[PDB]
């Protein structure tokens, strides 16, 4: 199923998170290892994926089930173009200079809320200027590259 290079690249990326080197990692870091290889599932997808793979609540996952999970997930993917429209619909007047207050307000309450640290880092990197407004275009261009 997986490519000849992938079956080794995934194993090499697997050992960076194993505390004991036994090929099994804690389940709480699944959303990091799976994200790091180009996938972008939400925590709801993570819960759905862990329910079908964990039954006794052990909290341990080894290499083969991770490989099967990634093979199942890889079948769908998205490009970077669809990111722009998400920010476009958040500009009520097409100014392109959305301020930090509503940007923090929306995604800390709407959708699937993040913690305080994530938004702290995000509007710390994005809001370079002290005016309190963030240019979305430069943000996306500099982070995507």
């Amino acid at each position: 199923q997986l490519t000849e290079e992938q079956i080794a690249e995934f194993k090499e990326a697997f050992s960076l998170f194993d505390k004991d080197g036994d090929g099994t990692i804690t389940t709480k870091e699944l959303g990091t290892v799976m994200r790091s290889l180009g996938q972008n599932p939400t925590e709801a997808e993570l819960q759905d994926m862990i329910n079908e793979v964990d039954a006794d609540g052990n909290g341990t996952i080894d290499f083969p089930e991770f490989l099967t999970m990634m093979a199942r997930k890889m079948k769908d993917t998205d490009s970077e173009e669809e990111i722009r429209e998400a920010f476009r619909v958040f500009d009520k007047d097409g100014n392109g200079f959305i301020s930090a207050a509503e940007l923090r307000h929306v995604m800390t309450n709407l959708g699937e809320k993040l913690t305080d640290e994530e938004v702290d880092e995000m509007i710390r990197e994005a809001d370079i200027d002290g005016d309190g407004q963030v240019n979305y275009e430069e943000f996306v261009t500099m982070m995507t590259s």
């Binding site: 080794a8 599932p41 429209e85």
Partner: protein, 613 residues
């Protein structure tokens, strides 16, 4: 509010979380590279102990000298009775980035008084928290004077109501090592009932010559470096080997082992072991292998998750100890837990073996700017460890974007890795050529990874580094021409020029040569024979690659043995080693060429609950 806003929010959230995970993976890879690079050099340095240990088996069983110093000199006055006001003056002198050189007389006085005072202390120092109701433990400092000043400012100066325990490694990694040692000794002298010191693995004359401390001392005091180094080496002799807290908690630098017994360490003649990596200087009494092994295990051991006790091949010295041996040792010595400081940690502190081994590390920015955060432990009367964290030089750190803050660390790691990899350029190129039977110029990814692992033997995740060591490569083939060009860059050669390496024993430690050539003495008259000389060079070249090739040394003796084999002919006999080193350096060089002020307020801090960490 509408469903479109929800869709946009969740899409952006997914994208941001993916990028955060990517950055986390990059951080972990860089940390792995740094740790493996440090361990690869410590392991190579540690084989001198094995060489000495198996060479032993094979062979049969107040004077005034300081002179005036050139350059700018600070007129600070330090008297023999050290008081609190001297500490503030010393801090003020050392605070400035320039014009911080003390007069050699005061340095000699401080070192001599500290050496005289440290002789009376026992091997293991008992610390009682009944009166002070508080005790503080700090980790490695490694010349980070600003970190020590930050700790002092945040926690106050040591006193009878606020003692300190500095857990070794005071020097030889940073650019300001001497100041940390002088300040610590002055603080100990001013407060003898409230400051305790523990010897570390870097408190060795052999290790200092390899990590730049001796170079710093020679540069700072060109006219007096010899006697200052002698005084410092004398100070290293009497530092206590460990500390016992409240008769319940043991504080050691490295760790322990299955055969380690405190009832034996307390009876070791500490004065013999001026150096750890080379045999102690006994008075004709043949040395004991057990005590030296005891001290080595105490100083150099490391913990491991798996069970059993195996020899620590990762660092090249010491032994790995798991939870089973830790529990057995604690039950045998009736202790609660052991505090440790050998290994650096990303957060500065960690727990191991079911909260029974506490690792601490008080050096911030150990590898590069932003690598890790320092930490120190505050213990209450019930010995519950409160952890604090801090990062120095925050003002310069805040003047960069997050991408640049990651890029500086990434560039430092890549530069260090390429500098280390520069040594094996010829063998690496030959291995690459062998794997290309049709000289097409492109080899498979698996072959590339195998060649890299076989040559470097660092165990790094090479497949993740494919796009950085060899950029612009496809998913199936990698050209070695771009890789070879990376180590052939001029700036890499310039950086590698300043990096000291193994050997250079005469420049590093002439005492090492004296120890070797006194150990190989079959008789006590001081005369040796060439067959023993041949055996010694054979054993030396058996461990150190490309040492003498058994040719230059033998030819040198044949030029000198006019009256045959005999005594070690003093300096002119070491001219053989001198000319051999010069010839080797010239031979390798020809082959290569033939192609701000300290500020404690400039920091960020955080206090962590014992159970929240």
């Amino acid at each position: 509010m509408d469903e479109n806003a929800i869709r946009a929010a969740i899409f952006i959230q997914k994208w941001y979380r993916r990028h955060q995970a990517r950055r986390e993976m990059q951080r972990r890879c860089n940390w792995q590279i740094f740790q493996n690079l440090e361990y690869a050099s410590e392991q190579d340095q540690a084989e001198l102990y094995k060489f000495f240990n198996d060479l032993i088996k094979h062979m049969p069983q107040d004077k005034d000298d300081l002179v005036e110093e050139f350059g700018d000199i600070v007129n600070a006055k330090i008297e023999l009775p050290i008081r609190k006001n001297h500490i503030d003056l010393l801090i003020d002198v050392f605070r400035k980035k320039r014009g911080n050189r003390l007069h050699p007389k005061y340095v000699a006085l401080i070192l001599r008084e500290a050496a005289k005072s440290l002789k009376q202390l026992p091997n293991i120092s008992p610390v009682s928290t009944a009166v002070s109701q508080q005790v503080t433990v700090c980790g490695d400092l490694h010349g980070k004077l600003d970190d020590l000043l930050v700790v002092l400012h945040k926690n106050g100066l040591p006193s009878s109501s606020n003692p300190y325990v500095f857990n070794g490694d005071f020097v030889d990694r940073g650019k300001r090592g001497l100041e940390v040692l002088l300040l610590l000794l002055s603080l100990y002298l001013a407060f003898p009932n409230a400051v305790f010191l523990n010897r570390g693995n870097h408190e060795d004359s052999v290790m200092n010559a390899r990590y730049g401390f001796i170079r710093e001392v020679e540069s700072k005091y060109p006219r007096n470096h010899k006697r200052i180094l002698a005084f410092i080496d004398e100070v290293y002799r009497w530092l206590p080997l460990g500390s016992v807290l409240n008769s319940r908690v043991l504080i050691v630098h490295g760790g322990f082992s299955d055969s380690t017994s405190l009832d034996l360490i307390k009876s070791i003649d500490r004065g013999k072991y001026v150096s750890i990596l080379r045999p102690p200087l006994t008075d004709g009494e043949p040395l004991d292998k057990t005590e030296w092994q005891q001290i080595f295990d105490i100083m150099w051991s490391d913990p491991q998750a798996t069970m059993g006790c195996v020899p620590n091949t990762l660092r090249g010295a010491g032994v790995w100890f798991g939870p089973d041996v830790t529990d057995n040792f604690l039950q045998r010595h009736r202790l609660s837990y052991v505090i440790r400081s050998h290994e650096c940690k990303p957060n500065g502190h960690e727990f191991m073996h079911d909260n029974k081994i506490i690792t601490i590390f008080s050096a911030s920015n150990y590898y590069a700017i932003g690598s890790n955060k320092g930490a120190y432990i505050r213990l209450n009367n019930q010995l519950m460890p409160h952890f604090v964290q801090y990062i120095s030089a925050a003002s310069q750190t805040k003047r960069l974007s997050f991408k640049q803050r990651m890029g500086i660390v990434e560039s430092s790691a890549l530069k260090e890795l390429a500098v280390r990899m520069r040594d094996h350029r010829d063998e690496l190129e030959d291995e690459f050529r062998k794997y290309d039977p049709k000289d097409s110029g492109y080899i498979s990814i698996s072959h590339w990874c195998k060649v890299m692992e076989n040559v470097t033997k660092l165990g790094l995740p090479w497949r993740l580094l494919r796009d950085k060591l060899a950029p612009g490569t496809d998913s199936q083939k990698v050209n070695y021409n771009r890789t070879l060009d990376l180590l052939d860059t001029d700036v890499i050669l310039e950086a590698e020029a300043d990096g000291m390496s193994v050997m250079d024993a005469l420049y590093a430690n002439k005492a090492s040569l004296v120890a070797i050539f006194n150990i190989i003495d079959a008789d006590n008259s001081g005369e040796i024979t060439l067959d023993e000389f041949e055996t010694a060079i054979d054993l030396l070249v058996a461990h150190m690659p490309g040492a003498y090739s058994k040719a230059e040394m033998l030819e040198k003796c044949r030029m000198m043995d006019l009256n045959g084999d005999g005594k070690v002919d003093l300096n002119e006999f070491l001219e053989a080693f001198r000319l051999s080193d010069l010839h080797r350096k010239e031979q390798q060089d020809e082959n290569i060429r033939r192609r701000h002020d300290i500020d404690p307020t400039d920091c960020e801090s955080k206090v962590i609950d014992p159970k929240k960490s």
